[PDB]
Design a protein around this ligand. Structure first.
Ligand SMILES: Nc1ncnc2c1ncn2[C@@H]1O[C@H](COP(=O)(O)OP(=O)(O)OP(=O)(O)O)[C@@H](O)[C@H]1O
Ligand SMILES: [Mg+2]
Lengths: 279, 113, 1077, 240
């Protein structure tokens, strides 16, 4: 016979609905933010906002430091907690603290969404400004997203100003990308005519950028203004385009027309392609 | 000490003149003296507390304490003849024969006939 | 003090007896009294007539030995209606709820007309009392049948407080009047009227049995039986004046019980004679004086706590047995007299009764010791001691309560042999009434004189002694005794004196021309073993010389010789439990090892000597920087190495002892961490260079150290001494600590906890290790048995594969707790006692909710102060706030050297922490269920190995037991130091690197000391593994699983156990033999 | 056994385990994927997960060599990066404590190849190799587990060669001293900005990096309550 004892993983020798259930779960799965957030959500549902805060602190320490994704979930959870149940000062502290630990740019992005989902537009607008000053010179997403915010609120003239600020701050290499995406924002959410103007100036500065012509006609096809699509297609094929690229647009022009469904227009482009095939 | 031996240490030091010094004397300002005295007391207290009486004795023999004082006071003022002048034993713990035997590193008699 | 008062009230209410049961019994014995008056009277009878009257009845008269014979029983016998009354604690309403049950003392005063003035002689009052009791039991029994109470009442005889001269009747209730749920029993005491016999004839010095010797035990029984209501009125009077009497009583009662003190006789052998009655009478007596000036020691306004503290302080300080005694008047200030009667005395001038007659000298000394130890706890202010004083039972195990226990099987046990029984005689039958009282005193006096200063306290227990017998019998019947001796065997239990228990020579009286009385007793006692010897100082003394052994203490030999010579040559004395614990300590391969005592540290001192020789060489060396200090820190320098150091035994894992080499302060040290280490190595290279030249007899080599994480440039110098010892040298620099703090500060905020762990392991090795060895070496001289027990505890930890995860310092700090915090027990004085007290602590340690914080000091400065104590308490609460379940940290061990509490107990996996707690709990239960014996101790030291998921068997090519220095062997180091590796055990390193690789999925454990726990040859080791619960099931595939897995589906993987086995197998190469999964 | 690739794109690469007398056709399964990264040193690399024990570059040279012969392919493995089996090199302790001498997942590594022609060629052999388990498990390759690097690691209690150690200390101290000397000259050499701003460096300062760190690390008492007429008037106000 021997001195034997069953191994204990929970210190018992000494769905979740209770504190013990969550703590028991956290014994074996400390690195799961899902368990931690659910436990924090449970306390908030119990109106124990102060208890929820300490649990967030424990998760920040207990979760392994190499689990950056799980850490991000807790920080986002804290931001949502303070925004919904806290005040301005405590939310500033967590927001300030979060940037110290995680990527400061990413935390800025998440709080902007937190303000947007919570319908706090005034604090969102202030935060787009502050983040653009710090990260605008390097990140083009802020200008696009901030332009998206303004267009969503029927603020077109300001959005034009932000793009000018974006061009001033961003390096010259990203000037094409920021303008192109803002033009895409106008087509999807704002004034398509404004979007057309941005593309027209863009192609004017960079005629040889054939991919930009492809993007511009893609927006026109999406807008379903067939006359403008047809006029654009004839313009594109009269440019410095390779034989391989010529087939791509002639095919796309044919594919667009059969979507429209007028067989004669497909017949015309086939003839239009055929003469270009001879050339 | 850590063995509960209360003792009093006396340290003595003298100012010296530098290699290229031309003044006849090497007096220190009273601010230097208080600074040097504060450093010496800090070293003496540290060495005695973090040591036993037997270990403190092993420090006295090679004069390692004095070299420690010389290094600490080097940036304040040059010194010479730094010595732990005297050591008094003011109080002693309860005597422990076992500890004394170990410090020195039982015997049956021989039948008388 | 306010906290204490609220703690009392919680205790008082917790043990308060429920008032419903008081009514339930009070309804019964109010009816029982009616039955007693129904009993008819009787006419005078002679012994022939009463014998005939009871000849055919089931009841038999419980006549006390010597039973009355027809010749000497000429007086006559009669029965008359008693004076029924209620006495005891129930009368005073000072009882408490006891799960084992309480007793209600009902007193029946025999009418005075039944007695003559001279009936206190020759058991005349005792034999009249017995027939009175028997006649009552007869008529009482039939009246119970008449009233239909006999269905649920069980009647038996018993001895009042185990007094053989005072049989009584006990009414107990088995499962409307049924009071079984009350847990009570009614005792029918037949007392005499007050002042029937002249008390002056009953004084302890006077005699009342004709054979002249005094008869204190007989005189007490008759006199005290006449004084029952008198002391009820005395306590009832004092109960009014002081409002805290009853509260102070239950505190005393609860104090006494946990110590295993009773009001029973101690002369038969049991520990007792001082109960709630004696404690209450002492408290009451002190309320009317008690000082040498007859000044009061207790005041009627004192609270419950202050009355208790005053009585305890009286017991602790004032001696009532040898030099001094206390006299009081129950009916007159109590005064302490300096003259003592060599036996516990609390005299009563009003009644001429010594309340402490039932109290032996041996148990009075233990009481005076217990009282003095709580007075210390009661004057304590830094720690709370309410649980120790009141809520901790120390009488559960005798082995935890006593250092050594010897079982004495007396011969011919259906009567004792003629020679042993003949020794009793008639002269002692007058002094010691019963044979067990005579042997209890005889065993005690020979055992006390033989051992002398080798012990502090001695107890003789008559094991298997019964005190209740059927109504059909006259005396108690024991299976072995057969009505001849009421016990199975004797147990001699001792509290030893570690400083001088293992002396080689027992000094005696000095020589003289005319042999003194002392010298005559010494030679008569010891016989041939005695001798006359002369010593180096030139003195001539009588003494006897013993022989030490590594397997048993000297006291085992002394008691065996002394008991067989003076008690009976056929006695069998055996203590085999202590012998096993001694054999579990590894036996070194040194000259005359088997003859060396376990308290001998010569092997440790010899290593220290060879270090001093090497110490001198290094200081006289010339180096760029002067040597500030060389500080040894290895295990052998604090006497904690499991295997004692042996020359040239380099297979031992503790062969190379660590030494911290420190130079003078310099500003030229490199300011980078890696450059600093290579700067340190350059100093070791020059030391080895100059040592290799000037001292060619010393050999040395270089090894790398990877204990401190991420610091990969540490190199240590290994010195092999010509005496045959190994030392490992590492340089400590003042710039070391502040570069590690620099790394923490410059680290990314996610990485800072990881860097702090590196700093923690740096300070555990370099900074705290020096303080630890210093303090632990110093105090160990005051705790002689600390070193054998900590070594045996480390032996125990290795058998169960726990040392690989428990650092040695944590084991040492757990093992010192019974020594520096012994309350409520005594400091361990045996290897058995100390080891089991360590297991008892770990069993009951709730490390999730309680910290362990130690005051590493010599016994009554560096005592923890209230300010420092609260600071360490605050460190625990803050730590548990972030880690309430104890996943990250389990054991909080702190002290002056480590106030943080996490220094030595960090990084232990939770299953290992609970495994240590689980095994200790299982070990204690095994001791409760089966006593400590040969079989249980083997179980304590044999591992489970079935609880683990898989077990891997390993064999080294050669048996390492001989080269590890264990006696079931090298005599020089190899000519090539690469050959040292060929005789080592690498399995410890294998598990370490495997644990790093499989940290996320597996926990691997092994035996560190293969030569001790590897069988006869010391070549067999086991790697036992544990799959964590997560990876035991299937998981979805992801890059960060960090485990060796095999596919089952496209997005499912499972632990690939077989692949792991091939990796574990390919580590040991030839070593791995077998797999069990 | 039919599983050839995980849908996330990790190709299963089984290996036959060796025969050990303690273990009387068990396999070890390695997962591989193309590694893409703009970083030059990480370019031309193959991401590997669940490597066998102590897999050095010599181990991969054997494995790729077997694949080369079996499929008649030319592939050369340059080096195996980020192979931290025991987590010893997780942090660079030298870099945290000073900038001189050091300008700077688990169970995974990057296998770098000599050129793109080699790495793409290897992927096809791996893709073919993965299929073998379903069809012909017998012809799966066997991982040796024994190499010269493995033997040195196994020999734990081997004394260091003093001759090698002396050269290691000598060269490292030599390089370090040059870097301290250059650093100390830099600080105390009259640093003047383009705008004629002169930096303040104390005596004994040894590095600019240390000046920057010290920067990152780092009226009420003189005011009178009763000096101005308005202050005494305010005191007069509260007096009543
Ligand atoms: N040492 C003693 N000397 C004299 N009389 C005693 C002594 N011990 C007990 N008695 C007598 O025995 C009676 C009852 O004894 P017992 O020890 O059962 O009482 P108790 O202390 O009230 O009870 P308990 O311990 O069960 O609560 C006491 O009232 C007293 O008459
Ligand atoms: Mg009683």
């Amino acid at each position: 016979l021997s001195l034997s004892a069953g191994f204990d993983w929970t210190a018992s020798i000494l769905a979740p609905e209770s504190v013990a259930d969550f703590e028991r779960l956290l014994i074996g799965n400390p690195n799961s933010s899902v368990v931690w957030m659910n436990y924090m959500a449970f306390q908030l549902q119990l109106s124990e906002i102060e208890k929820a805060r300490e649990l967030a602190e424990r998760a920040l320490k207990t979760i392994n430091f190499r689990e950056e994704a799980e850490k991000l979930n807790i920080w986002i959870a804290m931001l949502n907690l303070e925004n919904t149940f806290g005040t301005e000062e405590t939310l500033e502290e967590v927001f300030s603290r979060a940037c110290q630990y995680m990527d400061s740019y990413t935390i800025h992005t998440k709080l902007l969404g937190i303000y947007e989902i919570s319908e706090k537009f005034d604090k969102a607008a202030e935060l787009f400004k502050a983040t653009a000053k710090k990260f605008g010179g390097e990140k083009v997403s802020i200008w696009v997203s901030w332009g998206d915010f303004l267009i969503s609120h029927n603020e077109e003239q300001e959005a034009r100003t932000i793009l000018g600020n974006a061009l001033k701050a961003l390096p010259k290499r990203n000037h094409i990308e920021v303008v192109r995406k803002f033009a895409q924002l106008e087509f999807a959410k704002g004034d398509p005519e404004r979007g057309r103007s941005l593309f027209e100036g863009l192609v004017a500065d960079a005629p040889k950028r054939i991919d930009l012509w492809n993007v511009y006609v893609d927006q026109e096809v999406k807008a379903k203004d067939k006359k403008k699509v047809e006029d654009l297609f004839e313009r594109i094929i009269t440019k410095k385009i390779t034989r391989k690229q010529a087939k791509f647009f002639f095919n796309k022009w044919l594919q667009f027309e059969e979507s429209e469904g007028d067989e004669k227009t497909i017949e015309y482009v086939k003839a239009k392609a055929t003469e270009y095939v001879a050339s | 000490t850590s063995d509960d031996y209360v003792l009093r240490i006396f340290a003595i030091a003298f100012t010296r003149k530098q290699a290229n010094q031309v003044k006849r004397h090497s007096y220190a300002q009273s601010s230097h003296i208080r600074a040097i005295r504060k450093v010496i007391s800090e070293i003496l207290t540290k060495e005695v507390q973090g040591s036993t009486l037997a270990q403190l004795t092993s420090k006295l023999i090679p004069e390692v304490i004095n070299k420690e004082i010389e290094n600490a006071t080097k940036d304040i003022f040059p010194l010479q003849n730094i010595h732990v002048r005297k050591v008094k034993l003011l109080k002693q713990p309860k005597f422990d024969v076992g500890a004394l035997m170990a410090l020195h590193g039982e015997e049956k008699g021989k039948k008388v006939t | 003090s306010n906290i204490f008062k609220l703690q009392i009230d919680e205790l008082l209410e917790q043990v308060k007896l429920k008032q419903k049961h008081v009514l339930k019994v009070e309804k019964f014995l109010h009816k029982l009294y009616d039955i007693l008056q129904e009993i008819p009277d009787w006419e005078e009878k002679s012994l022939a007539e009463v014998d005939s009257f009871f000849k055919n009845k089931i009841v038999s008269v419980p006549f006390v030995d010597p039973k009355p014979i027809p010749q000497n029983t000429n007086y006559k016998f009669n029965y008359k209606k008693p004076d029924i009354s209620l006495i005891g604690s129930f009368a005073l309403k000072a009882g408490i709820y006891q799960p084992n049950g309480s007793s209600i003392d009902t007193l029946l005063t025999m009418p005075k007309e039944l007695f003559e003035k001279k009936d206190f002689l020759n058991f005349r009052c005792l034999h009249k009392r017995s027939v009175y009791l028997a006649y009552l039991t007869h008529h009482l029994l039939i009246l119970l049948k008449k009233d239909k109470l006999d269905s649920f009442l069980q009647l038996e005889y018993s001895y009042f407080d185990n007094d053989p001269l005072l049989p009584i009747l006990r009414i107990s209730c088995s499962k409307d009047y049924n009071f079984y749920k009350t847990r009570f029993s009614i005792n029918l005491l037949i007392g005499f009227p007050y002042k029937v016999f002249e008390p002056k004839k009953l004084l302890p010095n006077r005699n009342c049995i004709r054979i002249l010797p005094a008869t204190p035990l007989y005189n007490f029984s008759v006199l005290s039986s006449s004084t029952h209501e008198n002391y009820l009125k005395y306590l009832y009077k004092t109960k009014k004046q002081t409002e805290s009497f009853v509260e102070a009583t239950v505190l005393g009662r609860l104090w006494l019980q946990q110590r295993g003190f009773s009001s029973n006789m101690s002369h038969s052998g049991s520990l007792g004679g001082f109960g709630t009655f004696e404690f209450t009478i002492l408290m009451a007596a002190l309320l009317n004086g008690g000082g040498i000036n007859s000044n009061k020691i207790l005041l009627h306004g004192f609270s419950s706590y202050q009355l208790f503290k005053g009585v305890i302080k009286y017991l602790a300080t004032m001696d009532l047995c040898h030099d001094g005694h206390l006299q009081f008047h129950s009916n007159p200030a109590s005064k302490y007299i300096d003259e003592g009667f060599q036996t516990p005395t609390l005299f009563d001038k009003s009644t001429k009764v010594n309340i402490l007659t039932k109290m032996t000298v041996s148990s009075y000394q233990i009481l005076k010791e217990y009282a003095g130890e709580t007075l210390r706890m009661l004057n304590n202010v830094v720690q709370d001691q309410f649980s120790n004083i009141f809520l901790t039972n120390i009488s559960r195990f005798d082995n935890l309560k006593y250092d050594l226990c010897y079982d004495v099987q007396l011969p011919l046990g259906n009567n004792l042999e003629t020679s042993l029984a003949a020794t009793f005689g008639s002269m002692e039958r007058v002094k010691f009434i019963t044979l067990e009282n005579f042997l209890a005193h005889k065993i005690t006096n020979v055992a006390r004189y033989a051992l002398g200063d080798r012990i502090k306290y001695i107890q003789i227990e008559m094991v298997g002694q019964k005190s209740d017998f059927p109504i059909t019998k006259r005396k108690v019947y024991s299976n072995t005794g057969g009505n001849h001796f009421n016990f199975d065997f004797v147990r001699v239990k001792l509290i030893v004196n570690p400083s001088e228990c293992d002396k080689l020579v027992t000094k005696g009286p000095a020589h003289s021309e005319t042999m003194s009385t002392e010298a005559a007793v010494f030679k008569n006692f010891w016989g041939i073993k005695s001798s006359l010897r002369r010593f180096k100082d030139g003195s001539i003394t009588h003494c006897c010389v013993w022989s030490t052994s590594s397997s048993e203490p000297i006291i085992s030999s002394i008691v065996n010789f002394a008991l067989q010579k003076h008690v009976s040559k056929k006695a069998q004395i055996s203590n085999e439990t202590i012998k096993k614990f001694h054999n579990f300590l590894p036996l070194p391969n040194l000259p005359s090892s088997a003859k060396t005592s376990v308290l001998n540290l010569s092997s440790f001192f010899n290593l220290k000597k060879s270090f001093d020789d090497l110490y001198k060489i290094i200081f006289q060396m010339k180096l760029p920087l002067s040597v500030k200090s060389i500080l040894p820190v290895g295990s052998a320098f604090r006497y904690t190495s499991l295997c004692q150091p042996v020359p040239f035994a380099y297979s031992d894992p503790d062969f190379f002892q660590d030494v911290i080499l420190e130079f003078e302060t310099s500003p030229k040290w490199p300011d980078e961490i890696t450059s600093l280490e290579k700067a340190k190595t350059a100093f070791l290279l020059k030391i080895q260079e100059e040592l290799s030249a000037n001292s060619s007899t010393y050999r040395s080599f270089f090894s790398r150290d990877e204990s401190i994480p991420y610091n990969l440039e540490i190199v240590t110098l290994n010195i092999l001494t010509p005496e045959g010892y190994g030392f490992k040298f590492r340089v400590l620099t003042e710039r070391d600590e502040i570069l590690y703090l620099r790394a923490i500060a410059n680290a990314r905020n996610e990485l800072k906890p990881e860097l702090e762990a590196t700093f923690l392991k740096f300070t555990a090795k370099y900074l705290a290790s020096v303080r630890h060895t210093r303090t632990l070496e110093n105090i160990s001289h005051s705790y002689q048995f600390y070193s054998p027990v900590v070594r045996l505890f480390k032996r125990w930890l290795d058998t169960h594969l726990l040392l690989g995860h428990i650092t040695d310092e944590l084991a040492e700090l757990i093992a010192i707790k019974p020594f520096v915090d012994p309350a409520p027990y005594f400091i361990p004085g045996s290897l058995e006692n100390g080891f089991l007290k360590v297991l008892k602590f770990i069993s009951q340690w709730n490390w999730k909710d309680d910290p362990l914080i130690l005051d590493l000091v010599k016994p009554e400065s560096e005592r923890l102060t209230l300010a420092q104590y609260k600071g360490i308490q605050m460190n625990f609460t803050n730590l548990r706030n972030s880690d309430p379940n104890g996943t990250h940290l389990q054991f909080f061990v702190a002290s002056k050297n480590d106030p943080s509490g996490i220094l030595y107990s960090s990084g232990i996996p939770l299953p290992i922490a609970t495994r240590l707690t689980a095994l200790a709990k299982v070990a204690v239960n095994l001791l409760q269920t089966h006593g400590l014996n040969q079989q249980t101790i083997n179980l304590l030291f044999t591992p489970g190995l079935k609880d683990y998921d898989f077990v891997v068997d390993l064999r080294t090519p050669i048996g390492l037991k001989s080269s590890c220095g264990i006696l079931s062997a090298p005599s020089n180091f190899p000519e090539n130091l690469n050959d040292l590796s060929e005789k080592m055990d690498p399995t410890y390193q294998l598990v370490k690197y495997l644990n790093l690789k499989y940290k996320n999925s597996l926990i691997l454990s092994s035996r560190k000391y293969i030569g001790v726990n590897g069988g006869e040859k010391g070549d067999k080791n086991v790697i036992t593994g544990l799959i964590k619960p997560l990876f035991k099931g299937a998981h979805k595939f992801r890059v960060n699983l960090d485990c060796n897995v095999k596919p089952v589906d496209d997005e499912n993987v499972i632990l690939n156990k077989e692949a792991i086995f091939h990796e574990i197998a390919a580590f040991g190469n030839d070593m791995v033999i077998n797999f069990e999964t | 056994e039919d599983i050839s690739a995980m849908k996330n794109g990790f190709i299963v690469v089984p290996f036959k385990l060796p025969d050990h007398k303690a273990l009387p056709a068990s396999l070890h399964f390695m997962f591989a994927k193309r590694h893409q990264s703009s970083n030059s040193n990480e370019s031309d690399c193959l991401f590997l997960v669940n490597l066998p024990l102590l897999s050095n570059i010599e181990h991969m040279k054997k494995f790729v060599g077997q694949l080369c012969g079996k499929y008649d392919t030319v592939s050369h493995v340059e080096e195996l990066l980020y192979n931290d089996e025991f987590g010893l090199h997780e942090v660079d302790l030298s870099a945290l404590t000073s900038d001189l001498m050091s300008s700077t997942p688990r169970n995974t590594a990057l296998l770098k190849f000599v050129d793109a022609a080699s790495i793409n060629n290897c992927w096809n052999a791996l893709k073919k190799y993965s299929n073998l388990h379903a069809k012909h498990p017998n012809e799966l390759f066997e991982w040796t587990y024994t190499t010269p690097s493995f033997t040195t690691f196994v020999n734990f209690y081997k004394p260091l060669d003093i001759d090698y150690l002396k050269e290691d200390i000598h060269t490292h101290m030599a390089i370090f001293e040059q870097r301290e000397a250059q650093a100390q000259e830099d600080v105390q050499s009259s640093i003047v900005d383009e705008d004629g701003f002169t930096l303040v460096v104390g005596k004994n300062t040894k590095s600019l990096n240390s000046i920057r760190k010290k920067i990152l690390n780092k009226i009420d008492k003189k005011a009178k309550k009763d000096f101005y007429r308005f202050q005494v008037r305010e005191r007069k106000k509260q007096e009543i």
